[PDB]
Amino acid sequence: PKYEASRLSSLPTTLDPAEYDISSETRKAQAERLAIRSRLKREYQLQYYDPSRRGVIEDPALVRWTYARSANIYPNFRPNTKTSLLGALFGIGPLVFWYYVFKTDRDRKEKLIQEGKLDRTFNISY
Amino acid sequence: SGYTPEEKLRLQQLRELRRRWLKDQELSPREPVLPPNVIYKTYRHSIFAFTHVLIPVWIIHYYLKYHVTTKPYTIVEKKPRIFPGDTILETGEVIPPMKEFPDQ
Amino acid sequence: PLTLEGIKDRVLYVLKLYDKIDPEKLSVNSHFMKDLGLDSLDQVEIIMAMEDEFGFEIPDIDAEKLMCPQEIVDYIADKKDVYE
Amino acid sequence: KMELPDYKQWKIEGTPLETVQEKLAARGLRDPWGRNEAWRYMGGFANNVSFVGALLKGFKWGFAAFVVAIGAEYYLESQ
Amino acid sequence: ITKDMLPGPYPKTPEERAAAAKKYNMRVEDYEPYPDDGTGYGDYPKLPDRSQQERDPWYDWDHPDLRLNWGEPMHWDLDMYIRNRVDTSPTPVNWNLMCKHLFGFVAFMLFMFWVGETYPAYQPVGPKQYPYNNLYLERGGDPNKEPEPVVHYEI
Amino acid sequence: AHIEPRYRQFPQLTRSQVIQAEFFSATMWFWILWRFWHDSDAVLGHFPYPDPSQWTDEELGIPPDDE
Amino acid sequence: YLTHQQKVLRLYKRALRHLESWCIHRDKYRYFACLLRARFDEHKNEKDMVKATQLLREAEEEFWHGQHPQPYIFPESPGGTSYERYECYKVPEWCLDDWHPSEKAMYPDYFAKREQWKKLRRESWEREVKQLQEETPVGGPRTEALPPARKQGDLPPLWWHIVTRPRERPM
Amino acid sequence: HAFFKAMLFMCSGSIIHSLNDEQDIRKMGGLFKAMPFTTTALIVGSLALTGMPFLTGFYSKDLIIEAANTSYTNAWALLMTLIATSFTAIYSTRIIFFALLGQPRFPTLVNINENNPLLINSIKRLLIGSLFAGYIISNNIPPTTIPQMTMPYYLKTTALIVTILGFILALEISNMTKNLKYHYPSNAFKFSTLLGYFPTIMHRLAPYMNLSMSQKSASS
Amino acid sequence: MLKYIIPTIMLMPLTWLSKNNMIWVNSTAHSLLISFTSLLLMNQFGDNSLNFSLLFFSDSLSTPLLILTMWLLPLMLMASQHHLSKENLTRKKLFITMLISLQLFLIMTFTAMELILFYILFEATLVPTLIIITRWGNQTERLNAGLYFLFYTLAGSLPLLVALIYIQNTVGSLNFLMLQYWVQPVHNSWSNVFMWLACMMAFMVKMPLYGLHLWLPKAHVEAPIAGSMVLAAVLLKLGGYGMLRITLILNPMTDFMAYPFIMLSLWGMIMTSSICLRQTDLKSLIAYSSVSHMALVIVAILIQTPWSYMGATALMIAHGLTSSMLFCLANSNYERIHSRTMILARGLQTLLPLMATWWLLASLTNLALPPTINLIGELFVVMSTFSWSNITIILMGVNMVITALYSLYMLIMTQRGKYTYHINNISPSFTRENALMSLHILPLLLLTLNPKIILGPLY
Amino acid sequence: SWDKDVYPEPPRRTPAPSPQTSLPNPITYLTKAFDLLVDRPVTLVREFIERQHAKNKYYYYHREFRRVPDITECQEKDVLCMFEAEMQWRRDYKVDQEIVNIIQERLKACQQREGESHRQNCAKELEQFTQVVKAYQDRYHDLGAHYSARKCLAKQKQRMLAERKAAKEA
Amino acid sequence: GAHLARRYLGDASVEPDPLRMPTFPPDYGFPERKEREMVATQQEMNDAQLVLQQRDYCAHYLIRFLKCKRDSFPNFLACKHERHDWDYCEHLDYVKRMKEFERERRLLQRKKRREQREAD
Numbered sequence A: 001p002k003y004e005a006s007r008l009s010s011l012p013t014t015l016d017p018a019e020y021d022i023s024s025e026t027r028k029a030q031a032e033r034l035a036i037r038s039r040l041k042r043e044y045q046l047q048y049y050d051p052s053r054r055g056v057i058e059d060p061a062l063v064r065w066t067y068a069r070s071a072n073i074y075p076n077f078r079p080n081t082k083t084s085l086l087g088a089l090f091g092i093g094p095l096v097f098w099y100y101v102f103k104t105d106r107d108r109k110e111k112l113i114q115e116g117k118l119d120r121t122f123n124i125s126y
Numbered sequence B: 001s002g003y004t005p006e007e008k009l010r011l012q013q014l015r016e017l018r019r020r021w022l023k024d025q026e027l028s029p030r031e032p033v034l035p036p037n038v039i040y041k042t043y044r045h046s047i048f049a050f051t052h053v054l055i056p057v058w059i060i061h062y063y064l065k066y067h068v069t070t071k072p073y074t075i076v077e078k079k080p081r082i083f084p085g086d087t088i089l090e091t092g093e094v095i096p097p098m099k100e101f102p103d104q
Numbered sequence C: 001p002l003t004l005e006g007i008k009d010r011v012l013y014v015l016k017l018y019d020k021i022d023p024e025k026l027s028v029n030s031h032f033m034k035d036l037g038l039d040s041l042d043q044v045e046i047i048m049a050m051e052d053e054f055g056f057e058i059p060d061i062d063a064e065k066l067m068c069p070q071e072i073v074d075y076i077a078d079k080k081d082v083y084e
Numbered sequence D: 001k002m003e004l005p006d007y008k009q010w011k012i013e014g015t016p017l018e019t020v021q022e023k024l025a026a027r028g029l030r031d032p033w034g035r036n037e038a039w040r041y042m043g044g045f046a047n048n049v050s051f052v053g054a055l056l057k058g059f060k061w062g063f064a065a066f067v068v069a070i071g072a073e074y075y076l077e078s079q
Numbered sequence E: 001i002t003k004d005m006l007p008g009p010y011p012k013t014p015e016e017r018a019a020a021a022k023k024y025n026m027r028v029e030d031y032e033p034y035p036d037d038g039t040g041y042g043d044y045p046k047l048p049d050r051s052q053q054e055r056d057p058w059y060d061w062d063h064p065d066l067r068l069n070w071g072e073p074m075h076w077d078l079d080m081y082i083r084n085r086v087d088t089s090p091t092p093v094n095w096n097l098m099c100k101h102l103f104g105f106v107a108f109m110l111f112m113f114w115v116g117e118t119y120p121a122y123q124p125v126g127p128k129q130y131p132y133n134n135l136y137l138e139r140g141g142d143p144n145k146e147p148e149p150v151v152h153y154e155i
Numbered sequence F: 001a002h003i004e005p006r007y008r009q010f011p012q013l014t015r016s017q018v019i020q021a022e023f024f025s026a027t028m029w030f031w032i033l034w035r036f037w038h039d040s041d042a043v044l045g046h047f048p049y050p051d052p053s054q055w056t057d058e059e060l061g062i063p064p065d066d067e
Numbered sequence G: 001y002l003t004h005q006q007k008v009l010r011l012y013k014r015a016l017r018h019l020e021s022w023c024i025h026r027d028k029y030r031y032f033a034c035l036l037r038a039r040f041d042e043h044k045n046e047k048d049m050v051k052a053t054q055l056l057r058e059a060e061e062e063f064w065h066g067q068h069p070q071p072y073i074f075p076e077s078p079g080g081t082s083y084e085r086y087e088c089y090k091v092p093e094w095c096l097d098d099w100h101p102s103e104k105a106m107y108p109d110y111f112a113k114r115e116q117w118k119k120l121r122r123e124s125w126e127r128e129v130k131q132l133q134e135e136t137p138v139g140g141p142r143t144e145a146l147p148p149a150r151k152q153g154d155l156p157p158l159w160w161h162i163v164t165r166p167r168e169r170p171m
Numbered sequence H: 001h002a003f004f005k006a007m008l009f010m011c012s013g014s015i016i017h018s019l020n021d022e023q024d025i026r027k028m029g030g031l032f033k034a035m036p037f038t039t040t041a042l043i044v045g046s047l048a049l050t051g052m053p054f055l056t057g058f059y060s061k062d063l064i065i066e067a068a069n070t071s072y073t074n075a076w077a078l079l080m081t082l083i084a085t086s087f088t089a090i091y092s093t094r095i096i097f098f099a100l101l102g103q104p105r106f107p108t109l110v111n112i113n114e115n116n117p118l119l120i121n122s123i124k125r126l127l128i129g130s131l132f133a134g135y136i137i138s139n140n141i142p143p144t145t146i147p148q149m150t151m152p153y154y155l156k157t158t159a160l161i162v163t164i165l166g167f168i169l170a171l172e173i174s175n176m177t178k179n180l181k182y183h184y185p186s187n188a189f190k191f192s193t194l195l196g197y198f199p200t201i202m203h204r205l206a207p208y209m210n211l212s213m214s215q216k217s218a219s220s
Numbered sequence I: 001m002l003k004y005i006i007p008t009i010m011l012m013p014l015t016w017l018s019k020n021n022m023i024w025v026n027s028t029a030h031s032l033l034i035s036f037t038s039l040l041l042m043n044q045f046g047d048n049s050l051n052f053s054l055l056f057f058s059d060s061l062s063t064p065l066l067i068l069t070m071w072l073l074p075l076m077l078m079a080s081q082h083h084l085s086k087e088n089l090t091r092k093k094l095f096i097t098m099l100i101s102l103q104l105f106l107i108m109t110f111t112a113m114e115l116i117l118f119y120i121l122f123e124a125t126l127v128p129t130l131i132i133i134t135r136w137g138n139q140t141e142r143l144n145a146g147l148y149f150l151f152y153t154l155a156g157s158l159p160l161l162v163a164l165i166y167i168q169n170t171v172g173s174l175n176f177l178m179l180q181y182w183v184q185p186v187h188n189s190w191s192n193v194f195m196w197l198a199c200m201m202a203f204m205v206k207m208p209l210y211g212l213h214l215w216l217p218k219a220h221v222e223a224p225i226a227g228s229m230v231l232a233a234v235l236l237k238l239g240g241y242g243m244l245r246i247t248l249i250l251n252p253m254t255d256f257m258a259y260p261f262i263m264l265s266l267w268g269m270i271m272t273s274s275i276c277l278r279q280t281d282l283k284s285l286i287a288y289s290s291v292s293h294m295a296l297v298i299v300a301i302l303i304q305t306p307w308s309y310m311g312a313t314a315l316m317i318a319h320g321l322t323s324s325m326l327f328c329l330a331n332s333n334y335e336r337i338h339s340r341t342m343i344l345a346r347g348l349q350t351l352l353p354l355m356a357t358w359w360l361l362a363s364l365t366n367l368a369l370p371p372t373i374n375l376i377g378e379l380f381v382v383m384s385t386f387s388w389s390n391i392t393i394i395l396m397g398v399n400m401v402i403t404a405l406y407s408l409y410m411l412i413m414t415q416r417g418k419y420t421y422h423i424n425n426i427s428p429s430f431t432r433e434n435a436l437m438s439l440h441i442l443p444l445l446l447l448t449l450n451p452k453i454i455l456g457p458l459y
Numbered sequence J: 001s002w003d004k005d006v007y008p009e010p011p012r013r014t015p016a017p018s019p020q021t022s023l024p025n026p027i028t029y030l031t032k033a034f035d036l037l038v039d040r041p042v043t044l045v046r047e048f049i050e051r052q053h054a055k056n057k058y059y060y061y062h063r064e065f066r067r068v069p070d071i072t073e074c075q076e077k078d079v080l081c082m083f084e085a086e087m088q089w090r091r092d093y094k095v096d097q098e099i100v101n102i103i104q105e106r107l108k109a110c111q112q113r114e115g116e117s118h119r120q121n122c123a124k125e126l127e128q129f130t131q132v133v134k135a136y137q138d139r140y141h142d143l144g145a146h147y148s149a150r151k152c153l154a155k156q157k158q159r160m161l162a163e164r165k166a167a168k169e170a
Numbered sequence K: 001g002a003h004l005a006r007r008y009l010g011d012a013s014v015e016p017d018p019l020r021m022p023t024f025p026p027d028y029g030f031p032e033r034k035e036r037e038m039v040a041t042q043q044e045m046n047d048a049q050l051v052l053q054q055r056d057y058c059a060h061y062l063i064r065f066l067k068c069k070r071d072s073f074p075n076f077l078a079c080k081h082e083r084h085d086w087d088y089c090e091h092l093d094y095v096k097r098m099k100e101f102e103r104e105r106r107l108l109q110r111k112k113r114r115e116q117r118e119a120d
């Protein structure tokens, strides 16, 4: 029985077919990945260990993330079929759904009260 | 798999410093420099009962007797159960006994 | 409340109860491969025995480098803030 | 500071570790960590009660006090 | 932080892709932006959709609680993938099989509760009998009216 | 401390803990035995359960088939 | 990034821990720990790497099928019941600089010794940076490894936050 | 339930403290004589929980089972309740067997010690309660219902019978773990171990869907 | 009201004629004295409101809003004086003058008898507020925040001016006491539909109603701390106060015109509560939390029941103290790390123990722990909306779950976990900051002992 | 202290102690200790306080409101008359709220006092509560937050119109 | 259980319906059937404040037990004899309900057996 990965249960590394096909090209790629991490680690450490530094080591990666999650969204938005349907279905759809649920419920309740068939015997707080 | 000679040396140097640092966390004899039988077990329990039971129950009883129970329906008790053959203190009434049972 | 000598005593105690090690040729500086003739599977078992002895885990990245008893003592003393 | 008991005293003979060494001997294998487990089968750890013995802890004295307690009850109801 | 070091629009040309990768501290071979629909991702990298729980806990992370290193590109949904929220870790049982057994167990139990409701257990007795016309007054019945008598006989 | 740790050996015990443990284990068994001597009905059954199939048709008011 | 040997040894350790979780009893675990070591030993000298990788590949699939769904975890290991338990008591050393003078006055000797450690850190920083500059290739560091002190009287570069880090049981 | 359940946690705290924050029963064992007082409290609490006659748990659990047996009720719910009563004896045996009996499975530096008077006295008071509290409470509270005391023998003794069988079945399962045979996990074993997968699925799917909507749709 | 208007005006010469180094001491001391005298407005009668003159009146609705307004000025001064330390003297006095002028406009707004007088002061508040945001905010985005704030308000407010002038022509008066007696029912016609919208939309934008709320997260993220406090605490409540008064003359048309806005609010509160779970900016999270809380107030005002009007009043007062406290808490972190990113500084309970306690108490009031007046207000709205329609309990109950999750997510993220290693400038909490937090939470919790004073006229 | 007619209480019937045990009653001794240790000192402090109050006797009064013409007698738009009628209606509304509160308090006191027999023994109180809630609902329910005498009168006239219509056709 | 198999698996037309019994007249096959006697008056159970479910044909024993309990305080081990009397009265009450079930069961069986006569 083979592992079936899902969105919320990743494929274990030990069962990854590609984790064993480590060619000279892949080993080269891994070395380059470690080179970037080491370069960033050194830049951070030279500030982190600096005895005369008091404050916050600003992280451009964190700044880019919070900026991407807000300021950069509208400039890269295009009204097309996809964004219009999601906009209409998710923004307008729930408002119409709830309007009919409440309008229908209230129309029924009003009709019962107007006929004396809704029991409000002790109802004097509203 | 084993430490390289350069890794061995760095770990050795850091190890010396770390142990000196931990030794420096020990407090000296004068630190901190602070600015300027059965019967004694009855006392603490006696004073504790006085300040945590007697005084609070004096306050509550005064509060309940002279403020809460002077207002309608603030303390409402379920009326006492009355069984056959009982005597009422208020009136002196005597509740009759139940009928004679069949034998069982 | 561990001490440097207490750690060494117990690390050597465990190794003296391992059948693949001559308890007389065992010193704190013996290299599990060059001096005692063990292999890398034996090394894994020795590390696992140390984790059971002291009740904590040594990650594989660190574990694979401990090749003599003294390095095990140094590793354990470091993680447990033992300075005497 | 701490005196470790002498290591030579830890032997697998007389313990279920000896049984395992015999099962592995049949196949040609050996258990090299056996002596490192011996302490768990020796000394004050050698004999432990069974599950029924655990439930029956204190039954001997509870039963003794029961007989005296009911023996006294019969004596009183006799008078 | 200068504007050249901030997220930009979707990269159209290979030079832009190489420039975007540099800004995000990635290999140009590892850099892949989100699909250029009108959703507003721009050139922000699309990283693996993995929880931070999946990262190596023995590595000396700059941020150990997050398991993040300083300067590495953060996942778009990092705040959803912190160790307090969504875990994507591999599971000993396949996700699809896990859903079948949980749903199947629940469905079976619900069915059997309907069955046990349609065929209740009970004892072989008649109804409990109460005096005074089934306690008509005690149960609050109107004193001024009269219940039809409820009579109980001996047996 | 008053109880020193041991290496690979059974722990040091005090008399107080052994005696107190035994006394309360014995109290549990005395109590069960004493309670079961007086209140076995609470375990075995307070009242007899009748056999309905052995009640006569007279006492149940069952008329004969020709009535 | 892990070699073949590293992968095989990590699988052996992981499989023994899950095996011990299944067995529980020490005598039973010893029996099956030896049987498991025999299986790894049966192919120890395999030379055709293609064959060995297939053996490792299959062994990982066998491990996944037979793993304990709730293996034993050392209490302080990641995922253990005491993991990160004492982090709320770990306070960084720089917090002491903000103590009120009357708080420092309670530990005159501790704070005199602390002042010497800060002097050592200050006097050593520029040499630490210089050593890293002249030992790092032009492109930059390619690994995270750091060097030792070379000259006598020097300290290993970037030592402060390793040496002065909080104790594992800080209270 | 408040008496013996509180005692059970304190007994487990006593063991956990003695084994340096170890909480896995697979790393316990051999504590029956090393921790005699915690052992005694753990046995009394386990018996009270499973409804041993005349301990504190017997004065509620056995009436509840008798009332359920003779009530006009869902038949499936009644069976589930009775089976869970048998399981109560199984998991109670699981704690006693793996924690107290057999040979020690904990680390070599022995620091077992339960001689602090605060530990002993606090457990002692709850032990006395776990023996007598139920009897004392049942004999003082006024009656508010009509208890159902007439029933067939097999409805009267059902609680004791299924509990005993649970103990017998549990012992066989536990002693089988000592055989030199290596078993592979069934689906039932994994379902029980992983809590029916309810946390695994719900605690991943529901947060994911809700948190994805929060950013993708509502916010963006 | 002259006993409050005139001393408020005198704060301006006081600030300008003070010694250079005593502007904060003097303005803070005397604004606290003015706040003390505001308690004299509690002389309320069961039947009649307190009608001072032809211009000004105070009833049980405007009284708690006045006392909150006069309480906030000293708190704002304390909150502002640290980030303004390097500002030159004349520009400090100008900043304080804008705060005083805002208080002057606000107390006159909440007590104006005539709706057109209310409109003018209602609109005058834009000027000092806009100036405070765009002149003393820190970031480039403050200029855009000022514009969004300005034109969202005027887009709805200018139609309100036309409607009010039309009403005075038709009825003959905009005096609120007169309107209580001369009010006539509103009949169904397209003319009255747009009269209804012109009368309500200006207030909906200020609440803000869901869909017209985009200006608010901009304005907070850019405003200085004092701007955020008065914006959250008082200026939002201009809209709620506006509807509570103007709905008198819109019946029975509100029976059906409310439906689109109840739907936007009922759904909006869930949408904006969910949004809080994924916010990365701490100030933006608190801003979105206000939108969700004010959605209840809009629903309460629109369904027009005695219980909903009492809940709306208590909610407006309670949210004023809670939300302003949360901005002050977030600002205190900002003064150390100079960033609003929530995930930047973590585990702060380890470093600032007492401040973490203020964080806990502000969170518990935000999620409406009983018996805080936050819970009292929300519960009264829940009770009244259930009578409006039973199904609303599903939406109201779900929003309670989400509110707890984001209230405690904010607490857990910033206070708990491990501290950030490289942030080494977290200096101990100043006495000023601790006093600022206590002057929010202590009156908030003390009101639980006597809730009637913040329940409004329907009590 | 309070009017017993407004807040009625049935006569109290306490049974006399009728022990059938030889053991002492722990409550009786505790009762005696409470009266000695708690009741007597508390009573002395109160008696001293009552002495000081007796020296400084002064009075307050229950405000009396003369009746004024109600909304039905007010000409349309005559604010001067509508204002006094409206203020009177608002005062009466507050009073009627408290009348309902008194009846509910009677009902709740009866339920607790009568114990397990409350269902049969509180019929009179439940009836009075039912009738007063009906009258209060007729007057004041559904008026809305912006209620007034004018709206209350409109509600009544609608009810009178319906009752006339039903009566006529019947 | 036994009766449940007969109704749910066997013939349900000759088993009592627990929710509709009795279905035959109380005097059917029972000439001159006496009435159940009630020893406790309505007013006595009202003052004893018995729970309504406890106001049955055994209430006089419950009242006697309740009085003893109050009068024997603090001796909570007294009134065992009174408790047994109430328990026993309840047992007979239950047996009477068991006879009602069996009477109905035999009448239903007789009816079917008779309705075979009228078509055989």
Ligand SMILES: CCCCCCCCCCCCO[C@@H]1O[C@H](CO)[C@@H](O[C@H]2O[C@H](CO)[C@@H](O)[C@H](O)[C@H]2O)[C@H](O)[C@H]1O
Pocket (backbone or CB within 6 Å): E097, E100, E101, E104, E105, E108, H083, H187
């Ligand atoms: C006292 C307890 C009372 C309640 C007991 C409830 C038990 C009810 C269990 C219902 C769940 C059964 O769920 C069922 O499990 C089996 C076992 O894998 C699955 O079986 C399937 O999956 C497995 C594994 O992938 C494959 O062999 C194959 O595809 C197929 O057999 C079914 O797809 C699933 O529907």
Ligand SMILES: CCCCCCCCCCCCO[C@@H]1O[C@H](CO)[C@@H](O[C@H]2O[C@H](CO)[C@@H](O)[C@H](O)[C@H]2O)[C@H](O)[C@H]1O
Pocket (backbone or CB within 6 Å): D061, D062, D065, F018, F019, F022, F023, F026, F027, F030
């Ligand atoms: C109304 C009465 C209420 C109940 C009263 C019950 C009183 C019972 C008092 C029991 C006191 C027993 O005291 C204890 O008994 C056990 C019996 O195993 C002894 O234990 C003895 O056997 C065990 C092994 O079986 C070992 O510890 C050892 O061999 C020996 O000590 C203890 O050394 C003794 O200290």
Ligand SMILES: CCCCCCCCCCCCO[C@@H]1O[C@H](CO)[C@@H](O[C@H]2O[C@H](CO)[C@@H](O)[C@H](O)[C@H]2O)[C@H](O)[C@H]1O
Pocket (backbone or CB within 6 Å): I016, I017, I018, I019, I020
């Ligand atoms: C016929 C109609 C004319 C109406 C004129 C009424 C006001 C006349 C005021 C005359 C006095 C003005 O006073 C002049 O200005 C200010 C305010 O006092 C003083 O200097 C000021 O310094 C600082 C503020 O900068 C403050 O401490 C304080 O306001 C004051 O000391 C000058 O030293 C003084 O020369």
Ligand SMILES: CCCCCCCCCCCCO[C@@H]1O[C@H](CO)[C@@H](O[C@H]2O[C@H](CO)[C@@H](O)[C@H](O)[C@H]2O)[C@H](O)[C@H]1O
Pocket (backbone or CB within 6 Å): I036, I037, I038, I039, I040
């Ligand atoms: C919450 C605390 C607020 C603190 C406010 C601080 C400012 C206090 C302002 C005090 C104003 C007092 O104002 C003045 O008081 C005196 C009492 O001596 C009143 O004196 C009058 O009161 C009433 C009036 O009906 C009558 O008894 C009588 O005519 C006279 O005693 C005056 O009518 C009033 O003009």
Ligand SMILES: CCCCCCCCCCCCO[C@@H]1O[C@H](CO)[C@@H](O[C@H]2O[C@H](CO)[C@@H](O)[C@H](O)[C@H]2O)[C@H](O)[C@H]1O
Pocket (backbone or CB within 6 Å): I188, I189, I190, I193, I257, I260
């Ligand atoms: C967020 C957006 C909110 C949008 C809210 C939209 C609300 C819509 C309200 C619809 C009701 C408008 O008011 C309604 O208009 C119609 C005309 O069409 C009027 O109709 C009037 O003229 C027509 C002639 O065609 C006559 O037949 C009718 O007798 C007369 O009433 C009604 O008098 C009135 O009931």
Ligand SMILES: *C(=O)CCCCCCCCCCCCC
Pocket (backbone or CB within 6 Å): E112, E115, E116, E119, E121, E122, E123, E124, H069, H075, H076, H078, H079, H152, H155, K001, K002, K003, K004
């Ligand atoms: C006889 O006296 C009745 C006792 C009740 C026995 C319970 C039988 C449980 C059977 C399982 C239920 C399955 C759903 C139809």
